Design a protein around this ligand. Structure first.
Ligand SMILES: Cc1ccc(CO)cc1N(c1ccnc(Nc2cc(N3CCOCC3)cc(S(C)(=O)=O)c2)n1)C(C)C
Ligand SMILES: [Mg+2]
Ligand SMILES: [Mg+2]
Ligand SMILES: [Mg+2]
Length: 270
C-alpha cells in the first residue's frame, strides 16, 4: 500500500542521520491531493530491504493521532524510500534538551499523555514496540508527540534489527527476551523520567552492565528535579519487577488524565 511515483517527491534539506541512510525533509504532491511536507528515510541484501520496508508495512496499518503517519514508499525505483508526515520539532529527547526547563509540568504531562495514548493503541493492536525511548518519540509544531520506529525485525540474538536497548528494557526482556506490552510499560516509565528530566540520559552515570546489575538489586531512578511525586510514583509502578503488577496502557492514560483534571495534585514534589 501507498507505493508512490518518485516524480511526486521533491527532496529538500538533509535533516538527520538515520540508522541505515540519510533523513531528509521533502514535499509530496500527488494528483488530486494538496501538497504536504514529508520526512524521508532512505536505504544491502534482499533480507535487509525486506526488513527496511517492514517498517512501512506495519506503519501503513496504524491510524492514530499519536502514531507517525505513513505517506508512502518508493520501491519500484532506487534508492528505496519511506515517506512519513513531517514532525517539525524532531526527536523528543533532543527537543527537550534544547528547551530545558522551558515547558510547564502540565505541558510535559500532555506530551506523556499523547505518548501513552499511542502506546495504548499499539497494545490494543497486539503490537509490542520493544524500543520505546524518548529518541523514538517525534514532536510536531503543536507539541503533539507521536510514537515512531516500527518494524517486524528481531534484535540481534546481518539483520537491521539492532541491539537490545538495555537502559529502556524491562528486566525480564533483557534476561529472557520476553517482550510484551508489560515490558513496553517499563520502557514507558523510562520515557516519563526522560521527559521530566528534559532529555537527560537514563542512568547517565552508569554503563549498560551497571544498569542491569542495579535494577536486579532494586535500584530505581530517583525523581527528576521538580518532578511531581505523583508522576514519579507512576514511574515506580511501571518499574515493578513483576510485569503483571505494572499498569496497563489504559490505566497509564487514565492516571495522566486524572492529573490533568486535578492539577493541584502535581504541586506535591519531594
Ligand atoms: C522519515 C521517518 C520514517 C520512519 C520513522 C520511524 O517510524 C521516522 C522517520 N523520521 C521522521 C519522521 C517524521 N518527522 C521527522 N522529523 C525530524 C525532524 C528533525 N529536525 C527538524 C528540524 O529541527 C532539527 C530536527 C530531525 C529529525 S531526526 C532524523 O534528526 O530525528 C526528524 N522525522 C526520522 C526520525 C527518521
Ligand atoms: Mg483510527
Ligand atoms: Mg524498534
Ligand atoms: Mg529502534
Amino acid at each position: 500500500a501507498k507505493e508512490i511515483d518518485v516524480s511526486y517527491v521533491k527532496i529538500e534539506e538533509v535533516i538527520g542521520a538515520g540508522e541505515f541512510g540519510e533523513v531528509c525533509r521533502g514535499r509530496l504532491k500527488a494528483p488530486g491531493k494538496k501538497e504536504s511536507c514529508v520526512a524521508i528515510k532512505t536505504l544491502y541484501t534482499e533480507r535487509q530491504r525486506r526488513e527496511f520496508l517492514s517498517e512501512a508495512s506495519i506503519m501503513g496499518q496504524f491510524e492514530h493521532p499519536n502514531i507517525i503517519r505513513l505517506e508512502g514508499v518508493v520501491t519500484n525505483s532506487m534508492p528505496v524510500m519511506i515517506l512519513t508526515e513531517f514532525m517539525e520539532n524532531g526527536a523528543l529527547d533532543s527537543f527537550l534538551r534544547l528547551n530545558d526547563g522551558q515547558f510547564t509540568v502540565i505541558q510535559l504531562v500532555g506530551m506523556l499523555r499523547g505518548i501513552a495514548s499511542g502506546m495504548r493503541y499499539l497494545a490494543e493492536m497486539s503490537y509490542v514496540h520493544r524500543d520505546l525511548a524518548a529518541r523514538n518519540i517525534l514532536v510536531n509544531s503543536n507539541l503533539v508527540c507521536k510514537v515512531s520506529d516500527f518494524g517486524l525485525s528481531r534484535f540481534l540474538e546481518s539483520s537491521l534489527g539492532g541491539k537490545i536497548p538495555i537502559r529502556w528494557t524491562a528486566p525480564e526482556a533483557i534476561a529472557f527476551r520476553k517482550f510484551t506490552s508489560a515490558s513496553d510499560a517499563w520502557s514507558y516509565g523510562i520515557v516519563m523520567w526522560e521527559v521530566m528530566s528534559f532529555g537527560e540520559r537514563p542512568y547517565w552515570d552508569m554503563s549498560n552492565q551497571d544498569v542491569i546489575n542495579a535494577i536486579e538489586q532494586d535500584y530505581r531512578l530517583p525523581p527528576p528535579p521538580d518532578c511531581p511525586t505523583s508522576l514519579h510514583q507512576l514511574m515506580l509502578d511501571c518499574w515493578q519487577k513483576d510485569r503483571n503488577a505494572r499498569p496497563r496502557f489504559p490505566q497509564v492514560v487514565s492516571a495522566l488524565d486524572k492529573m490533568i483534571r486535578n492539577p493541584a495534585s502535581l504541586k506535591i514534589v519531594a
